[PDB]
Amino acid sequence: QANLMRLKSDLFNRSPMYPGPTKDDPLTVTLGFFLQDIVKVDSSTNEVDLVYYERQRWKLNSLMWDPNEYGNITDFRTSAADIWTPDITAASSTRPVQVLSPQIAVVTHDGSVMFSPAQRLSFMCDPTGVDSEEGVTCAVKFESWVYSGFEIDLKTDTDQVDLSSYYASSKYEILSATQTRQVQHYSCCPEPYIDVNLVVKFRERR
Amino acid sequence: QANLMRLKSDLFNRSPMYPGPTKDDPLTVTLGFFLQDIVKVDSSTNEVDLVYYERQRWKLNSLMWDPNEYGNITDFRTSAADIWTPDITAASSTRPVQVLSPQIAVVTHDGSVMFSPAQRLSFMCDPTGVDSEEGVTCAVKFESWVYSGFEIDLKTDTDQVDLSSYYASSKYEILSATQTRQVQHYSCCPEPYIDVNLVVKFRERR
Amino acid sequence: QANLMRLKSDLFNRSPMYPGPTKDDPLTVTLGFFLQDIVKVDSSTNEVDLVYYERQRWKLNSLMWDPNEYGNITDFRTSAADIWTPDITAASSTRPVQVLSPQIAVVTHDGSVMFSPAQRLSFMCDPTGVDSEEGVTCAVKFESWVYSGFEIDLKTDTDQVDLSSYYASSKYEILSATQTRQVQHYSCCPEPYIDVNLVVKFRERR
Amino acid sequence: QANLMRLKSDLFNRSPMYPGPTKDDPLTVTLGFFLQDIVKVDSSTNEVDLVYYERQRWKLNSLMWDPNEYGNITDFRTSAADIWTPDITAASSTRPVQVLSPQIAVVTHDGSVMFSPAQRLSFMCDPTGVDSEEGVTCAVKFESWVYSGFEIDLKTDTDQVDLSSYYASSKYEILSATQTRQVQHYSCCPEPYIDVNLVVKFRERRANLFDENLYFQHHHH
Amino acid sequence: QANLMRLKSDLFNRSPMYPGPTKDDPLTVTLGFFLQDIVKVDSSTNEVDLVYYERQRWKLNSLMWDPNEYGNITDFRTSAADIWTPDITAASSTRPVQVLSPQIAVVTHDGSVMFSPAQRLSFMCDPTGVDSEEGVTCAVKFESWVYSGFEIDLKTDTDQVDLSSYYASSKYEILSATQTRQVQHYSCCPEPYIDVNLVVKFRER
Ligand SMILES: CN1[C@@H]2CC[C@H]1C[C@@H](OC(=O)c1c[nH]c3ccccc13)C2
Ligand SMILES: *[C@@H]1O[C@H](CO)[C@@H](O)[C@H](O)[C@H]1NC(C)=O
Known part of the structure; x- marks a missing residue:
């Protein structure tokens, strides 16, 4: 307890919170997604509901410590309210995202942070064709709402969405699921914006 | 980090929050709107549901700094709770607005602030005629709930609503969308009342 | 800004909050109501849903100032959390009231406060007869939940509910709308208890 | 104002909060209930929805004062967050209780507190038979979630639920409504557990003087 | 009151909060579950709704006291916000869990804590077959979201779910209900992850 209390106190009570990235310190x-369930489809509104979790990972110099100074602690868990977290947003949501997991992150001695929120999301998707065998494809972009690619760069570790927690008796079967970094220009703005495009092809289960 | 922490501390911890505008310091x-989707229509209640975001922009002397004094930082992101924000309200909503984006603003060295909330709004609209080819027109006014035009003046940069993120497979197709400043003067009251009128003509997609 | 910051600081940071009225300082x-829309009727539950706003007005000696001492400021806006507000409650609601406007009040140099919350309310109402031409009458009382008439007296400026923001294409048409002070006496207790009874006669629009 | 500010400051800012009752200081x-409306019945889920308020009353030595020391103040209103309140819970709810009234209590100079929250509750009830003339009976127990009868004892002032605010044009008509203290014993445990059982018999109903004075027998103290 | 106020002040205001378990101080x-009602089934979405409460129990050295020093107090009740609590999560929920009970725990002089939240949960379950006599089986895992088995180990006192508060007039009848500790290993990662699997077989009454 004592060593950990001391570490948390040195990292959080001795200087102000990380104020977020800038052009000079990007x-x-x-991100990586872990699909759990397509819960429903609404063909009268073109909304589809997904349950998933999302691994987010980043690294800050101000969260580093030497484990020899703190009883060999190499990592700890802490409330997400104690640290900065990125403002990753689904760009085509039609309802506020519902949080299904505790807001807690893992911080490691090299300054890396891992945060894995689970979420239910309603997003814009025309499910016409879902009852066929070819199925239907939908997409949703995830991006920083307020930071450009000069401040936050996004990436994936893999292009394949992990389906190993996908609910075997879902009403919908996943044909494919990818997650792809894109660099976007908009007409408003010279700065690039980075997103991760989640593309899911699915159909009604046999 | 250090320069930014220092700037935030100078702007926010060294004086009280901006107390809002007055007659003498208006x-x-x-505002500008960015329509993303007409999600649904309810002809039994005369409510229509819209997903959009809204760019809000204003400028405060108390948020100015010289970038040479702060390592050449020209802008930063910060939680909307750290600053004053205007109380822009949809006058004909029928439900609390659902927030779809992080509550974060961009503050620039000239004291200008940009806040871009994304929202789902239910508002009063008779959708009779939407299945026709002429479609239907609905309107919603946006105004300060408690500040008159002597304290807050509202304006648009353009009269055309941006439709470049409108969902291509929405059930509803946008025929036109404008946003117009209006100034009202009433016999009861010396104060002008300002609103921005969002007028949208739409119909069922072919 | 400076004079206003100073006024707010003198009124709010230099003594404890007004602890509410008493027998000795009533x-x-x-109150006045401003009906905007009867959104729906549910004849299987006898609930009706109204959207309206409500003007509340009162006066405190502790909110007085001399404008000459504060740069001629005669009024300001402030968050309702900064001041005491009365606990006016709809006695026959069936759901928590949904707030549609920012919780901000206007305070004037004579100590008077104006607070105008907009609300969606579900309340107990048998809509049988609404499809007829005579229509149907429903009523809802508004009262202080915990203060007697010795501490809070309610009144109206007029007995006519204002209908000038009523939605012209509502499904329901207002035949009449009144707001009337009533005094309730309990045999146990000398104190009167006050309410304002909102009585609305309405029917389906032609 | 000044005397009241001073009283609130003496009662709340000068010592820690009452930490709740114990075996030694029970x-x-x-409780009493004031039924307002059976709003609906769901026969596909066996849930019934009630709107009511609930008078709760208790007394603490730590909330006592002498009115002569405080300008003859005998009572005041205050936010429920300023005081300890009991954790009375509906044992068979199926949704979080929705609060319909401001969270404010009346505290009196003898240390007694009166708190009257209004609530919408969904609870477990098979409504089969509601469309008949015999109607249907539902019950819900109200109890402390964490305190035994050694720490909190519950009682009623009357066994009859007050129906004077019951909505006359509800879809459902009340045949009877009682509220009864019960003592529950479990074989594991010596401590009694107290509840108040709200029993309502009701059925589907079959189917002007808005006057400036109204007379009653202050329910929502 | 006085002795209790003093105890609470010594345990909570005189040192920082317990920062949670580690590899070195696991x-x-x-856990034990107490099923109260299967409220509904949705066969168009494969979601089922359960109402239950959950007894959670753990023990901290930092919550110990000697009753002789505090007027013979052996236990007290306190708001769950005053203490650390474990981040036990239903892994296959489809909506945020709705809390039905006050967030209050019992702390005992040996440092043990008892917390019993009541909850409504929507979770992933195919109810096909529920109208038959064999009924249908569904399952939901409860686990720490962020702590591995090196930091938090879960166990049950019994493998039988307690059904003594089950609603006699539910639309659904419980055929069986078990709760079982499981250890999960992933090939990427050396640390085990622990869950308690709640398995419920039920049918229309
Ligand atoms: C994540 N999204 C990216 C960036 C913010 C959010 C919404 C989109 O931005 C804009 O519309 C504008 C940005 N800057 C502007 C300037 C003038 C007009 C529009 C914008 C794209
Ligand atoms: C106050 O009013 C006087 C008289 O009109 C005026 O001269 C003065 O400028 C006002 N004060 C301020 C700070 O505006």
């Missing part, structure tokens, strides 16, 4: 956040 | 807030 | 609160 | 809470 | 949390 930050890279890695 | 403020101009610029 | 208060009068004036 | 407390009695008195 | 913790065991014991």
Whole structure:
């Protein structure tokens, strides 16, 4: 307890919180998705509901410590309210995201942070064709709402969405699921914006 | 980090929050809308549901700094709770607005602030005629709930609503969308009342 | 800004909050309703849903100032959390009231406060007869939940509910709308208890 | 104002909050219910929805004062967050209770507190038979979630639920409504557990003087 | 009151909060479920809704006291916000869990804590076959979201779910209900992850 209390106190009570990235000190956040269930489809509104979790990973110099100074502690868990977290947003949501997991992150001695929120999301998707065998494809972009690619860069570790927690008796079967970094220009703005595009092809289960 | 922490501390911890505008020190807030989706229509209640975001822009002397004094930082992101924000309200909503984006603003060295909330709104609209080819027109006014035009003046940069993120497979197709400043004067009251009128003509997609 | 910051600091940071009215220092609160829409009727549950706003007005000696001492400021806006507000409650609601407007009040140099919350309310109402031409009458009382008439007296400025923001294409048409002070006496207790009874006669629009 | 500010400051800012009752310093809470409306019935889920308020009353030595020391103040209103309140819970709810009234209590100079929250509750009830003339009976127990009868004793002032605010045009008509203290014993445990059982018999119903004075027998103290 | 106020002040205001378990100071949390009602089934979405409460139990050295020093107090009740609590999560929920009970725990002089939240849960379950006599089986895992088995170990006191508060007039009848500790290993990662699997077989009454 004592060593950990002391570490948390040195990292959090001895200087102000990390104020977020800038042009001069940009930050890279890695995302990966873990699909759990397509819960429903609404063909009268073109909304589809997904349950998933999302691994977010980034690294801050101000969260580093030497384990020899703190009883060989190499990592700890802490409330997400204690640290900065990136403002990753689904760009085509139609309802506020519902949080299904505790807001807690893992911080490691090299300054890396891992945060894995689970979420239910409603997003814009025309499910016409879902009852066929070819199925239907939908997409949703995830991006920083307020930071450009000059401040936050996104990436993936893999292009394949992990389906190993996908609910075997879902009403919908996943044909494919990818997650792809894109660098986007908009007409408003010279700065690039980075997103991760989640593309899911699915159909009604046999 | 250090320069930014120092700037945030100088702007926010060294004086009280901006107490809002008055008759003598009025403020101009610029709005623009970015329609993303008409999600549904309810002809039994005369409610229509819209997903959009809204750019809000204003400028405060108390948020100015010289970038040479702060390592050449020209802008930063910060939680909307750290600053004053205007109380722009949809006058004909029928439900609390659902927030779809992080509550974060961009503050620039000239004291200008940009806040871009994304929202789902239910508002009063008779959708009779939507299945026709002429479609239907609905309107919603946006105004300060408690500040008159002597304290907050609202403006638009353009009269055309941005439709470049409108969902291509929405059930509803946008025929036109405008956003127009209106100034009202009433016999009861010396104060002008300002609103921005969002007028949208739409119909069922072919 | 500076004069206003100073006024707010003198009124709010230099003494404890007004602890509410007593027998010895009673208060009068004036209410008026502004009906905007009867959104729906549910004849299987006898609930009706109304959207409206409510003007509340009262006066405190502790909110007085001399404008000459504060740069001629005669009024300001402030968050309702900064001040005491009366606990006016709809006695026959069936759901928590949904707030549609920012919780901000206007305070004037004579100590008077104006607070105008907009609300969606579900309340107990048998809509049988609404499809007829005579329509149907429903009523809802608004009262202080915990203060007697010795501490808070309610009144209206007029007995006519204002209908000038009523939605012209509502499914329901207002035939009449009144707001009337009533005094309730309990045999146990000398104190009167006050309510304002909102009585609305309405029917389906032609 | 000044005397009241001073009283609130002496009662709340000068010592820690009452930490709740114990075996050695137990407390009695008195409940009564005031049924307002059976709003609906769901026969596909066996849930029924009620709107009511609930008078709760208890007394603490730490909330006592002498009115002569405080300008003859005998009572005041205050936010429920300023005081300890009992954790009375509906044992068979199926949704979080929705609060319909401001969270404010009346505290009196003898240390007694009166708190009257209004609530919408969904609870477990098979409504089969509601469309008949015999109607249907549902029950829900209200109890302390964590305190035994050694720490909190519950009681009622009357066994009859007050129906004077019951909505006359509800879809459902009340045949009877009682509220009854019960003592529950479990074989594991010496401590009694107290509840108040709200029993309502009702059925589907079959189917002007808005006057400036109204007379009653202050329910929502 | 006085002795209790003093105890609470010594345990909570005189040192920082317990920062949670580590590899070096792990913790065991014991769970048991008390099913109250299967409220509904949705066969178009494969979601089922359960109402239950959950007994959680663990023990901290930092919550110990000697009753002789505090007027013979052996236990007290306190708001769950005053203490660390484990981040036990239903892994296959489809909506945020709705809390039905006050967030209050019992702390005992040996440092043990008992916390019993009541909850409504929507979770992933195919109810096909529920109208038959064999009924249908569904399952939901409960686990620490962020702590591995090196930091938090879960266990049960019994493998039988307690059904003594089950609603006699539910639309659904419980055929069986078990709760079982499981250890999960992933090939990427050396640390085990622990869950308690709640398995419920039920049918229309
Ligand atoms: C994540 N999204 C990216 C960046 C913010 C959010 C919404 C989109 O931005 C804009 O519309 C504008 C940005 N800057 C502007 C300037 C003038 C007009 C529009 C914008 C794209
Ligand atoms: C106050 O009013 C006087 C008289 O009109 C005026 O001269 C003065 O400028 C006002 N004060 C301020 C700070 O505006």
